[model samples]
Target: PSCKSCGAHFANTARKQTCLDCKKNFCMTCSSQPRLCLLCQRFRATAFQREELMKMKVKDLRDYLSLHDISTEMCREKEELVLLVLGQQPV
Candidate 1:
């Protein structure tokens, strides 16, 4: 497979992660969370996305952090934690 961004050929298909929003394949450095490519990640979080996550229970928000291998212990407040999780979708 080849990276959609760099046009570089990928010997390992697993290294090509799919973007969540654009459905584009990207190299590791050109990808974000295997959910968004660098280009799409630049769009940042949607208002609805944050609105949705903003209401998430602390437990579930922590769950998201855990799923992304983030340190849940570093945060405590809801909005503060919200911003932390938002970092996942950023560079």
Candidate 2:
């Protein structure tokens, strides 16, 4: 499969849809919870979509919080929120 955002190649997986915001075609390994199709770029631009997306986001967040062992503060921290991304800071 190919990432819709950046055109990067990826392995095929089970997910039905991919997020347009990051352009990352996620398989199970890269799928992010509470941050899936709700925040997807394609879904955020319209009024009705935004409303539905927000609901999904909130629901996903709650579900994820309940299942994970990490502290809510840890999840809310800026660094932790961005910790899973691939990037670097200038040295």
Candidate 3:
């Protein structure tokens, strides 16, 4: 089947997802929790008042990562930083 988000082909045995809100299928490898697509996930994240996001210096991000036992020594993208802080285990 084709992934709804990226429009790539994949076997049924591969991971896939369906968003309850928009009723769209997605590639699991391409999105997030709460059964939402990437766009919805970004929208939902903006709705919450995130105290941690208020002070997002690299030091602050690293400190929060330390609390989660995630090392900050390695180079990481901004998106990866957010995902790490959210407790999503790296594959």
**Cα lDDT computed for each candidate against the true fold:** 0.66, 0.37, 0.57
lDDT of 1 by residue, 1-91 (tens): 7777778977798877886755667788877763777645644444427776687678756745554557868565788767866777644
Predicted model with the maximum lDDT:
1
Relative to the true structure, candidate 3 reaches a TM of 0.44
- Per-residue lDDT, model 1, residue 48, is 29
Q: In TM-score terms, which candidate is top?
A: 1
As a TM-score, model 2 comes out at 0.22
lDDT of 2 by residue, 4-77 (tens): 33344555445434643443454433344534433342233333333343444543433333223224454553
Ordered list by TM-score, greatest first: 1, 3, 2
Residue 4 CA displacement from its true place in model 1, Å: 0.9
Which residue pairs collide in model 1, if any?
20-35
User: Can you give the TM-score per candidate against the true fold?
Assistant: 0.45, 0.22, 0.44
Q: Please give the RMSD to the true structure for each candidate, in Å.
A: 8.9, 11.3, 11.8
TM-score of 1: 0.45
